[PDB]
Amino acid sequence: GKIEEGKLVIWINGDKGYNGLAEVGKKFEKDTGIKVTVEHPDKLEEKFPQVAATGDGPDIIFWAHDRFGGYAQSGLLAEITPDKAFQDKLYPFTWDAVRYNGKLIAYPIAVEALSLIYNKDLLPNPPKTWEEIPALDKELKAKGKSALMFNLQEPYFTWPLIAADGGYAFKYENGKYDIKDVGVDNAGAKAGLTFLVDLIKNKHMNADTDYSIAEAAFNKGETAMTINGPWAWSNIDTSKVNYGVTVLPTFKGQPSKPFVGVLSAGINAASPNKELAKEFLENYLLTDEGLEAVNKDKPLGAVALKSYEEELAKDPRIAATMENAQKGEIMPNIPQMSAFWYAVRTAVINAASGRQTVDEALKDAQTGSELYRQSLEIISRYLREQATGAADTAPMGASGATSRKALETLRRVGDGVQRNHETAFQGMLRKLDIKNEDDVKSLSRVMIHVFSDGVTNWGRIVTLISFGAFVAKHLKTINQESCIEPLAESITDVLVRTKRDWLVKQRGWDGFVEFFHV
Numbered sequence: 001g002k003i004e005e006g007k008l009v010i011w012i013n014g015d016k017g018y019n020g021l022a023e024v025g026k027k028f029e030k031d032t033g034i035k036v037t038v039e040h041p042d043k044l045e046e047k048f049p050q051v052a053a054t055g056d057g058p059d060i061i062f063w064a065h066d067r068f069g070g071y072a073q074s075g076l077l078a079e080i081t082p083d084k085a086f087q088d089k090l091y092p093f094t095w096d097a098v099r100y101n102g103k104l105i106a107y108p109i110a111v112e113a114l115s116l117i118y119n120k121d122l123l124p125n126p127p128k129t130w131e132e133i134p135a136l137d138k139e140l141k142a143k144g145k146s147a148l149m150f151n152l153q154e155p156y157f158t159w160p161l162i163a164a165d166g167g168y169a170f171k172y173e174n175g176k177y178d179i180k181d182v183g184v185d186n187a188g189a190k191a192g193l194t195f196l197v198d199l200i201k202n203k204h205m206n207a208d209t210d211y212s213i214a215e216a217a218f219n220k221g222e223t224a225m226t227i228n229g230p231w232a233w234s235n236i237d238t239s240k241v242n243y244g245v246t247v248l249p250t251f252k253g254q255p256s257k258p259f260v261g262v263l264s265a266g267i268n269a270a271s272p273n274k275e276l277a278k279e280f281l282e283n284y285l286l287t288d289e290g291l292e293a294v295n296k297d298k299p300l301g302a303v304a305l306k307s308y309e310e311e312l313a314k315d316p317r318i319a320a321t322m323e324n325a326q327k328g329e330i331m332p333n334i335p336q337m338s339a340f341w342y343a344v345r346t347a348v349i350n351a352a353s354g355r356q357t358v359d360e361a362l363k364d365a366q367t368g369s370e371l372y373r374q375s376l377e378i379i380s381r382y383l384r385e386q387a388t389g390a391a392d393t394a395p396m397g398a399s400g401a402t403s404r405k406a407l408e409t410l411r412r413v414g415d416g417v418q419r420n421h422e423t424a425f426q427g428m429l430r431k432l433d434i435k436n437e438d439d440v441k442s443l444s445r446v447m448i449h450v451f452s453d454g455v456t457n458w459g460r461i462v463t464l465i466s467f468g469a470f471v472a473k474h475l476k477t478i479n480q481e482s483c484i485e486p487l488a489e490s491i492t493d494v495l496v497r498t499k500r501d502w503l504v505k506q507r508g509w510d511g512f513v514e515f516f517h518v
């Protein structure tokens, strides 16, 4: 389906101030005659890239900025071009969170960081360390309470602990990300997750605790502490708990490091209402009165709009939010963040339930988080050396032995496939009629149709990549060598998205090397 002209459909998460956002929508309707529909579907961050890919979905999508680079890389977002006068009304660091490949891909709304929320009637002074929580829980259990309950199903809430002693997602040094350097299974990450698993094993927490269970327990006065963001404060106000919002506890003397999000509004590339969306976001929502309406429903945190943020800055809950934000780090918006989050969510859940050990769980998470970059490194090098006749001299980098050995295996087995299946390869090449970067882009659909319509095994993966090499050779001979790298990226995208779970179960490219050994 096509997006309907002359209305606005907005998607925002169900924990945010969506009735507040609908009031801003009604003000827009009152001026313009244009109906604004606000929806909060489950798993909207997973649904958006599926429906938007077919030219469907909402006109405007709200999420934290971490998902938006993936969306932008897939052509799902309109470039945002506010004038200088509008850009200067928001803090520059919030604009930086919505910049992807030099282009603004969303409007920033507000800065979110988790804090420790504590019941002052149970815990007059909250604990400064994670390490004192077991003893504190023992004290509280004797009075029929617990120390701490928070969502263990979403790794956002457990990440601050994992990150504290040296866990990291993608390493940041000299003002740039080393996407090859992933810190999911180092000693720091292990120490943090082991502490969490030990809290569970000693019955200080329950592995099944989710968002709803922890909220209800805190807001009924059953647990002394929770971990949550500004959005949660509204329901706590209603409960009349005497609560404080403060700095997260330290682990091994070091601050808990929450991943900081910037709630952001992106415009769908398929929307025929882009001018209405920009008008709504700039002149209705991102105003003192627009942000107030949302903030009164569920608090936004530290708003991007300089004028309204000065008014809210005096709130000690916001001061505490920004203290934790400064100790933490701004999330990347790189396309791999979705894979990172999927990998760590599974690792926390399996470690918490005892399905896997901490070592086993973080091992798998590391492989999952590394999979795109390692797969690209191998696939791009094979395609490029096959096309040119000469290999890449560049160092292989992180997990370089695996990448080197996988490439050597792929040269052996892939050249065998190209030789033996030369007839079919030639026939399919002629059938596809590839001649430019436009035709290369259209291969993704046929590639995913043929590669996924069949069993999952290493032999079929070799075919995917070897035919890729066969096409790369053709692109070089027709003076279309600049298409080879986008082809490699497209093959890699198809492989890692469709076979993510299977690939991780095989120990990634080490499984490939082992399967075809001797």
Ligand SMILES: CO[C@H]1/C(F)=C/C[C@H](C)[C@@H](C)S(=O)(=O)NC(=O)c2ccc3c(c2)N(C[C@@H]2CCO[C@H]21)C[C@@]1(CCCc2cc(Cl)ccc21)CO3
Residues within 6 Å of the ligand: 417, 421, 424, 425, 428, 443, 446, 447, 448, 450, 451, 454, 459, 460, 461, 463, 464, 465, 467, 468, 471, 487, 491
């Ligand atoms: C019958 O004719 C096919 C052929 F010869 C199969 C022989 C093989 C060795 C089988 C015995 S198998 O079961 O081991 N493997 C597969 O069946 C298989 C797996 C993946 C795969 C394909 C097959 N493709 C169809 C092949 C290529 C040559 O003839 C087709 C190519 C494919 C789709 C077209 C566009 C395209 C573009 C790029 Cl850049 C890369 C790949 C592709 C998707 O990838």
Ligand SMILES: OC[C@H]1O[C@H](O[C@H]2[C@H](O)[C@@H](O)[C@@H](O)O[C@@H]2CO)[C@H](O)[C@@H](O)[C@@H]1O
Residues within 6 Å of the ligand: 013, 015, 045, 064, 065, 066, 067, 112, 154, 155, 156, 157, 229, 261, 341
């Ligand atoms: O749990 C992984 C998850 O973390 C972040 O999602 C947060 C979001 O930023 C908050 O606004 C709030 O809604 O809670 C969410 C956690 O349930 C990432 O933004 C998201 O991409 C990621 O999957």
